[model samples]
Target chain A: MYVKLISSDGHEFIVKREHALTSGTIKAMLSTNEVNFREIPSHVLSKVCMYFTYKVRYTNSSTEIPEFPIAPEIALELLMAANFLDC
Target chain B: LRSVNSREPSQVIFCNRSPRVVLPVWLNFDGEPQPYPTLPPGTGRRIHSYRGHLWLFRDAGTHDGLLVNQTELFVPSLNPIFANITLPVYTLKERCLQVVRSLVKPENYRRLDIVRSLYEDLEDHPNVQKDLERL
Candidate 1:
């Protein structure tokens, strides 16, 4: 079983591998190795920031993702950290 | 009605009106532009921005005056002296707030809205009612 997690700053979230397999990259990666939790890297972002992502294998309106607003500088640092860890 | 909504806050008398605007270097105190016309014919030499306020100088060594921030600053009819000029009024902190907000809230995360709604709907949570009673 996989678990979903949220960042302390609330900008991003982690979804279970099975659920994230909806993304092509996740689907490809799932077939090869042990699927572990990973995070979305922060580098290029549109003007609006994502506070959280939903964990959904299927589309459901009731599914909720939580977001907390953080400053740009803090976001950049988090993104770099995620990238460094290959998250 | 939509055009009125699109108008700048200074023109919108009906809603929340922002009192100031961030002015560019054109009217900034540290420029070569001649100062306000209120001063004597050859006075008011340079302009400078300091501490979120615009400043003007009468001469090389003098810190003369300020381009004050007030609603009147925009009303050409009220501030005829500065009618053609634009005065800036923004603090670094306020601008940084905009940047921070933009950075943290990309895509206006639907999850954030969901969570907020969840919080509001959480009145059923026992602790929520208990906490409110304490207040």
Candidate 2:
């Protein structure tokens, strides 16, 4: 249920169904069940897709206190993805 | 009569988090202390709420450590599987520790290994299994 994506920054990502729900663009695509099976490209990932993936996953998950279990700065960088995805 | 936005945020949420009933099945409060020969399950009964988190209280009437393990097995994980309640990390962390510390009543707490073994024995808990699958 996951697909791999190479970000513009050369970051590699293996995205899953839930992860895409975090993004409006992807959420819409998913809503319509229209994403191509192999590579549905998007200008989504900037320089930091990995961190954003982490954030979006963490925040949306059941963590009572949504936070970065890792370092703060690194966690914040991921927040960008979380916000973009959840927004 | 005017209708209030029942779903409106009644309080300003600065660091918003609420303690969710993360357990898939509710632990019965009235259960006797089947875990301990001398004490009943209520031995760990005490309650206090902090920030926005609801702490199910237990007195841990025993002065000594309870011989129970499975501590790591049953805990608030980084990802929650149950209800969507926010527990302010800073506040809940402190309170959980406090709850653990109130363990006292028996001669002394059982060694970690002994307690852990006891915990392992209860591994078949359906509630635990259901919640773990959420991750």
Candidate 3:
């Protein structure tokens, strides 16, 4: 199944529901049998989606973990957004 | 989201001196509540604080719905004087000691030394000793 995530800035992402479920908040929203859209920003939400993919690909590997790139300036806001989404 | 640079110096350290009792929840000053992971006796964790005000609540069972407790500072300079009971104070020192000892960096060695001196000072305080009979 696919889920539609719409950002506050109007950008939208259509991703696998499984990838969206990586976030507990998103999972709860989907489980409610309600809307598939979220209210996070396009840039922030996209980064979170990218992280979901990274988590899926390398979460169990024994290789050295890679640094997740994030702009230093927006780091705090992104963290707050992540916490709100529980991603 | 709150900024990391905006973090306050305030912190709450839970010292479970109850021997067998576990502190299951810790409510903040604004009456906002959050469940604690676990606060077993002889162990503690550094909790985030709000402003300079710190208040905590723990389940007091059926008789008392919650026990509201507050601390004056992140690091209490004077010994806490309980009216009816004497609770052990070494848990705070132990927590600080553990953090200091966990470091391996050369610059951190000085930090370790400073903490050790403070620990020794606490050890030398007149009221901090256990009675010989109990020992």
**Predicted model with the maximum DockQ:** 2
Better of 2 and 3 by lDDT: 3
Runs of candidate 3 exceeding 4 Å displacement = A32-39, B1-135
- Model 2 clashing-pair count: 30
Please write out the lDDT profile of model 3 over residues A1-87, one tens digit for every residue: 878777787777777787788777778777623344444577776776777676676554433334355654444345545646655
Ranking by lDDT: 3, 2, 1
Cα shift from native, residue B59, model 2 (Å): 21
Give the winner by lDDT: 3
Predicted structure with the largest TM-score when compared to the true one: 3
Q: Where is model 1 more than 4 Å wrong at Cα?
A: A3-15, A32-59, A62-74, A77-87, B1-135
Fnat of the models, one by one?
0.07, 0.17, 0.00
What would the per-residue lDDT of candidate 2 be over residues B1-135, giving only the tens digit for each residue? 111222322221112132221211112333211121122331222221122221121122312111111111211222222222233222212222233333332233343223343333223222332432444
> What TM-score does model 2 achieve against the real structure?
0.27
DockQ of 1: 0.04
lDDT of 1 by residue, A1-87 (tens): 443333333334344555444444445656633433333323322111221132231123322212233456554444333232222
Instruction: List model 2 lDDT by residue over A1-87, tens digit each.
Output: 664445445545566766555456565656533344222123334323443465454443444433323332233223333333443
In candidate 3, how many Å is residue B102 off? 21
- Of the two candidates 1 and 2, the one with more favorable DockQ, higher being better, is 2
Instruction: List, for all models, the DockQ compared with the true complex.
Output: 0.04, 0.08, 0.01
DockQ of 3: 0.01
